[PDB]
Each structure stands twice: as C-alpha cells, then as structure tokens.
C-alpha cells in the first residue's frame, strides 16, 4: 500500500532517490533514503542543562 501510494505521488518504490552534496555539487554514490519523519523536541534544552 505504501509503494502503491508512492506510485500515485510520482516518486520511486525504493523510497530512495539521488542526492547531491551541497558542497562539491557532485552526486552521492548509491541512492539514499529520503522522506518525512515526525520529530519531537523533548525539553532537555541545553541552556537549561548547562
């Protein structure tokens, strides 16, 4: 179902695409996995702990 929803999005089945270093501009060997992850910021913030 995931790959099938990837087809509808024009994006590959692998979930991996080509990525280029923003430094040298050259391509990265092998495909890398890119996507959208839900990420939380816990409150351990450094200006507290320090």
């Amino acid at each position: 179902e995931i790959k099938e929803l990837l087809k509808l999005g024009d994006l590959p089945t692998s979930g991996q695409i080509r990525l280029y270093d923003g430094r040298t501009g050259e391509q990265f060997e092998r495909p890398v996995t890119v996507g959208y992850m839900y990420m939380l910021k816990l409150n351990h913030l450094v200006d507290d702990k320090m």
Binding site: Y36, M37, Y38, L40, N43
Partner: protein, 100 residues
C-alpha cells in the same frame, strides 16, 4: 500535525481539556483571539433564557513545566458548528488532532 498518524491523536487532543470543545451546535456569532461566541440552534436550546454559548479562550499563561499554554480559534466568523466540535486548538494541537 502528524503527517504520519494513527487516528488516536484526535481522541487524545479532544478528550484532554487542552482544546476548546463546543457545548452545543449552532453558528458562530463572534470569533476573536480572546473569545468565541456561538449562537445555539433552537432544537438543542432550552426554552428559558434563550441564550448563546460563549467560550472564553485561555491565553498566554504559565504552565507547570514553565512552558506556554495558549489557545487559538480554529473557526471563522459565521461558520456552521456542530455539538462536540473543536472551536479552538490548545497548545500542540491542530484542527482537533494532536501535534506533538
């Protein structure tokens, strides 16, 4: 909002008091960042006092973790609302769902 969800986040957001839930269905008379006033439909309404449901939204105030707790209206001026609908989102909630 969680882009990848479960279907529970709606229940977690609503059942917890953070969000502001409609007491009775109707239309919104007034929508402010401060308050939200809803005109109740006659069917759900009681015979005496007539009346409209006015929800006073909690604004920026100290939480227990020294974070912020603030409410924002998710409804627009003169909008249809149903009983048990989210009128306003609390902190870390999006449109009746739970965004952590």
């Amino acid at each position: 909002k969680p882009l990848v969800g479960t279907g529970m986040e709606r229940a977690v957001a609503v059942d917890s008091g953070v969000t502001a839930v409609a007491k009775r269905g109707g239309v919104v008379q007034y929508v402010d960042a401060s308050r939200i006033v809803i005109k109740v439909n006659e069917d759900e309404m009681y015979p005496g006092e007539a009346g409209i449901d006015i929800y006073n939204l909690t604004k920026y105030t100290r939480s227990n973790q020294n974070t912020c707790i603030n409410q924002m209206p998710c409804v627009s001026l003169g909008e249809p609302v149903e009983r048990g609908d989210v009128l306003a989102d609390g902190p870390s909630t999006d449109l009746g769902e739970l965004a952590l």
